[PDB]
Design a protein around this ligand. Structure first.
Ligand SMILES: Nc1ncnc2c1ncn2[C@@H]1O[C@H](COP(=O)(O)OP(=O)(O)O)[C@@H](O)[C@H]1O
Ligand SMILES: Nc1ncnc2c1ncn2[C@@H]1O[C@H](COP(=O)(O)OP(=O)(O)O)[C@@H](O)[C@H]1O
Ligand SMILES: Nc1ncnc2c1ncn2[C@@H]1O[C@H](COP(=O)(O)OP(=O)(O)O)[C@@H](O)[C@H]1O
Lengths: 260, 248, 260, 241, 260, 241
């Protein structure tokens, strides 16, 4: 049973009017233009006992994602596929579950990770990729940071030698079958303006936000409208143009962090 | 003999322009709407799109059980999306699935943009929704059944909510999907609107699309929504509406 | 831990006296005699994806029950038996669980469904009958409506061809091994009167109600006293006479809906 | 391979005639930190009940303006049965709790303690059938021990049919293989039926016989409950009704 | 998520001074010296359907513990061991879970029960000892009573004939592979005094308590500091001297109840 | 089968003498949206702690009239260990939370904030033993960072016995195969033991040695905490007690 959150720290009409007056001049509180992403940090191999991990700082938002690989029997329905299990946890559920699914969907539908290559003995044994994403600092636009931390954690993942039946965890065979990275870009609709990567303040004054997932060849690979309000037709159209021309820049930057 | 291997996935667009259920790419499924069907609810509605049947009950603005969970200025919407174990071909476990949990949040947020909650502070409006038959588009059939059940409960709203799932099947953009089209199509994009305000209430895409396709799929969805909306307004007048599937 | 419900939907002493004053003249609010059942509608095969379903309207109460058949290994304790799993859900738990058990018990102990004919290969594979009952409109006397919807859903059930390995769901072999229908009759004790099939109002002013389950040759197959109050000895005696002479009426009507 | 239940002349599996109770043992105020407590034994069915007397209710929105809220818990210890029962509550424990609570609600004068909660905890230490009744009576007595006002005490037996013969107060075995099992609980001085169930099968005429026998048994038990209230401790060897 | 309990009962400053003024004279409310245990009753095989049970009365605290034996497949990790599963219940969780673990740990680490002796068929089938401990009367120092009830319940346990496939529960083969009993002694720090086996009142005025587990050979086998306050270095030192010289007396007495 | 723990030279599995700490890293105020935060790393055990400062309590009936209510969560990330620990809370996590809370309750002056709740969340990012202490210290520091008044800082080490030898600050390997494992946490300036546990086996005379050693280790760690408070960031290479 899903209900309107009684927490959600209301933000006065006067403060909203201050932020909107800045938007009218195409500048924000942080200083960035309406279309700018926040400063992006990625530290790879942060959690040492993970098979692969990534700590992402997008503005004040911090996500740590880590992968853990295991060998299981493939699930009777999908006999020639490995498994990917995404899991999000907020620390400061329902939003968590929604976050997990949105990320999962965009990693799986893009085929950024090829599950059919995670097979060891078809029908007998396959790899299961456990992806676990931990939001440590809720600085707004958690979704975009999650997609980044996820993708990064997968690109950092080390696969081990298989005794065929048993894992030898100190011989590294290779990396995950990853076709390409994926980015998610969230565009917030505050009043009558579209704003890329909304911060904590902007998310609490916005009508709704819409999130676009892209592959490097700029195919839309997932869309999620989110928020208590509505958005016009022309808005979603414009949002996606903005979202996409942002994706190019974010992808280049993500790649620099991930090494090529 | 790679030579005889032929894709496992079935063709979704077939002879003539047409699809697996004999519809053209621009045709809705049959629609049936009935209002005030539950006596003990504050507002109720049954919505059918083809083989997808949802029932929605509303238990109207009431004081909230544990007062600390209520809102000082707003009503709290409580929304439940649920599939009966016999809604699908194989039996769905009654215990709530992560997919049901997500769909509930998305449906609630959708309704929150339509319902004027700023009118009933310290109250809760309860919207329960079962899916009695699932054949794709069930998150939208549910949302619309809810929107209508709210209107039936006489609860003030900015507009009614109308919605279709638009998709891409065999490189062709199609309107209102089968379970079969949802299964094997490239893309599945549910869109819900407040048509008179041109406001998008719910918007999702699972699958893959080029920016232009996305924009085409977008224009077709609107047209479908507009036809459904008309039936909703009709169903509000006469309590009962039946529409044979046909071209947008 | 079971506690007195705090949504005890209280009904004023003045309204109670109005209803009791009518009982004293052997008539009720809705016009029926103290011993009459409410109007009864049954629509078979309402949920199309069910193996068999029934939507029952008893007054303002609405129950939808549906069956779904599966092939399971019989449980190690009962090797030559199929399975029946009843499940009730209220929509407007504890009362749900109690409803499920009362229905289950009366379908099983009457042997209205013969579980020993649901065997395919003894010890290897049997049919499991999933009965799911959904209360959509709580109009009082939910139990009697549940029994009806259940029985009807079972009589509407279609069994499929067993391909020798799994199920071929577009060839219909036959029906369920059903010996006979079963009816449950609830008699409420309001004040000093006994009232058959209490409605919403009558249930909230009653002391307690007692429910009798009957097979067509009028064998008592289940009794359940229910309600926060008590009932006298000759009350239970009288109640059952009334319950039983009602049962005959209700059984013939159920059968008409069920096609003999 | 089933067992013969009534052998050729009169005697059941435990050597009782069809109209004999099991041995009864009752003791009161056995728990020092409870407001009222009682242990009740019927043959091999032991139950212990504790009452934590009328008190303010934790989250006030769940309390009642005019009544006390009864909170009743029926529970079986993992070592009460032959095969270890799982401690996690079973659907059957959930139903039995609701049945027992409703039973007590008809006896306890709750309209005397508004905005309060009375908590009745019950554990079955040995289960040998009739455990829902042994529980209910232990509770009733623990309430009386807690000095909480009631219309009457609650006394109860399970009556059943075996090899076509109506029998009083059932075995583990008689519950298991008998054609019917009908627990009945009364407020004997008021002739008020507090709890009433039947699982199994009966003709209307045998239902009325079983009914009559149950009353007689209840009356005997009731007398022991009354004795146990004054002297705090009662033993009773198996006897004919 | 563990939080400070809101509904345990505060005890006035005036009543606290009264008890402390008595400690200052080396006497307590009930009459015993600062180092005395409360009166100890043990009734063996109290729960008749258990495979071994014990009802312990230590002061007003009452614990009933019972064992139930089963045959399972041993853990893939521990193929040459039987299982011990301790479970605590409070009736008047988190404190329960902590109690269960503390008892488990001291029974296991002491080797008081030898799990490697509970093997029937190595790798195929082993005994699982279900120990269930029920606190019926919370009279303070529940931990010490639990250890006693547990140990006593294990010493009372009867093992049955293993008949291949199953268990034949009316032939008694022997008793559990028990090396020795174990006692846990709790020492409370009230004000500036150390007090052995605190009662209900003493536990609510204490700063913190510390519990020492001992084998008959006076080896420390478990320590658990407990309570919302702190204890000095010399306190823990002194506590354990007191705890140990108490253990000798308590072990003697426990053995007398058990039949050495 | 079974490993060696102290070698023929007298060094441990990780090349430490029996009286050497692991390397220590502390950094404060690392989380922007928390009222106080800290990362603590003992060798390979890394914990992050966030504090959400004194705040009006959600359901008021659960608040205390005179005190703040501490809300403490000990949790291990699925990727903190070698074999993926389930995210669903384990009985061990539940106990550790209670132990850590009771530890903090002795240090934090809760008297000062009635009707409020102080949240302390703690995640273990890498587990290599002593994680209940690394968590507790990270929490203690995060509280000090949140500017919440305390009697003293909390410092702690696990002391144990490997092969008959008493050792300071254990590996997963020493925790795994050692005869004893004794976590001790103190308010060093007050000589107050805040947390104290022992799993395994020890003679009374040994217990007293392991104790003295623990104190010496605690004193060195305490100095770094005091340090890290003043400069926000502290590195310490392994060395002898
Ligand atoms: N547990 C399930 N068992 C069988 N079919 C299912 C299950 N869950 C979902 N489906 C099928 O998938 C269809 C489409 O689901 P989805 O893509 O979520 O869209 P919608 O929710 O709009 O139907 C459902 O309508 C249903 O037929
Ligand atoms: N899960 C179980 N496993 C083994 N024996 C049981 C179980 N549940 C109940 N029993 C035994 O069989 C009897 C059957 O219980 P039932 O007739 O349902 O209610 P009651 O507990 O009132 O007798 C119980 O009294 C008990 O002695
Ligand atoms: C395994 O088990 C270890 C926990 O052991 P435990 O005895 O609880 O000590 P600690 O809690 O101090 O780490 C983890 O560090 C993980 O590596």
């Amino acid at each position: 049973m899903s209900s309107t959150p009684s927490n959600q720290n209301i933000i006065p009409i006067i403060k909203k009017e201050s932020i909107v007056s800045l938007f009218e001049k195409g500048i924000r509180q942080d200083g960035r233009k309406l279309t700018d992403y926040r400063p992006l940090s990625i530290t790879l191999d942060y959690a040492k006992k993970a098979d692969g991990s990534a700590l992402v700082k997008l503005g004040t938002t911090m996500v740590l994602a880590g992968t853990k690989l295991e060998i299981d029997k493939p699930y009777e329905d999908t006999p020639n596929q490995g498994n990917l299990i995404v899991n999000v946890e907020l620390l400061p559920d329902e939003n968590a579950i929604e976050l997990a699914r949105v990320v999962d969907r965009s990693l799986r539908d893009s085929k950024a990770l090829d599950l059919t290559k995670l097979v060891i003995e078809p029908g007998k044994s396959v790899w299961t990729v456990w992806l676990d994403v931990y939001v440590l600092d809720y600085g707004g636009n958690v979704l975009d940071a999650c997609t980044l931390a996820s993708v990064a954690a997968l690109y950092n993942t080390k696969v081990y030698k298989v005794e065929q039946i048993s894992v030898n965890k100190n011989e590294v065979v290779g990396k995950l079958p990853l076709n390409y990275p994926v980015v998610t870009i969230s565009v917030a609709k505050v009043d009558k303006y579209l704003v890329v990567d909304p911060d904590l303040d902007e998310e609490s004054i916005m009508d709704a936000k819409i999130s676009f997932s892209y592959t490097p060849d700029l195919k839309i690979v997932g869309i999620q409208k989110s928020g208590k309000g509505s958005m016009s037709l022309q808005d979603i159209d414009q949002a996606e143009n903005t979202a996409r021309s942002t994706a190019v820049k974010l992808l280049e930057e993500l790649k620099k962090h991930l090494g090529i | 003999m790679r030579e005889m291997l032929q894709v496992e996935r079935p063709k979704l667009i077939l002879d003539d322009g047409k699809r697996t259920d004999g519809r053209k790419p621009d045709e809705l499924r049959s629609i049936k709407i009935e209002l005030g069907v539950l006596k003990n609810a504050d507002g109720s509605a049954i919505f059918e799109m083809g083989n997808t049947k949802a029932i929605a009950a509303v238990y109207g603005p009431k004081e909230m059980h544990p007062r600390h969970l209520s809102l000082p200025d707003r009503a709290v919407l409580r929304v439940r999306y649920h599939m009966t174990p016999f809604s699908t071909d194989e039996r769905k476990n009654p215990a709530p699935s992560r997919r049901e949990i997500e769909l509930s949040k998305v449906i609630r947020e959708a309704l929150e943009s339509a319902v004027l909650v700023e009118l009933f502070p310290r109250t809760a409006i309860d919207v329960f929704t079962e899916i009695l038959q699932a054949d794709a588009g069930s998150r939208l059939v549910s949302l619309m059944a809810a929107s209508l059940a709210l209107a039936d409960a006489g609860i003030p709203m900015r507009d009614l909510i109308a919605g279709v799932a638009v998709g891409k099947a065999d490189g062709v953009i199609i309107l209102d999907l089968n379970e079969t089209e949802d299964m094997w199509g490239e893309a599945d994009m549910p869109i819900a609107m407040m048509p008179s305000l041109n406001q998008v209430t719910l918007f999702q895409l699972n699958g893959s699309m080029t920016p232009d396709e996305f924009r085409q799929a977008f224009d077709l969805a609107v047209k479908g929504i507009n036809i459904i909306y008309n039936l909703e307004r009709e169903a509000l007048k006469s309590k009962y509406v039946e529409f044979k599937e046909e071209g947008v």
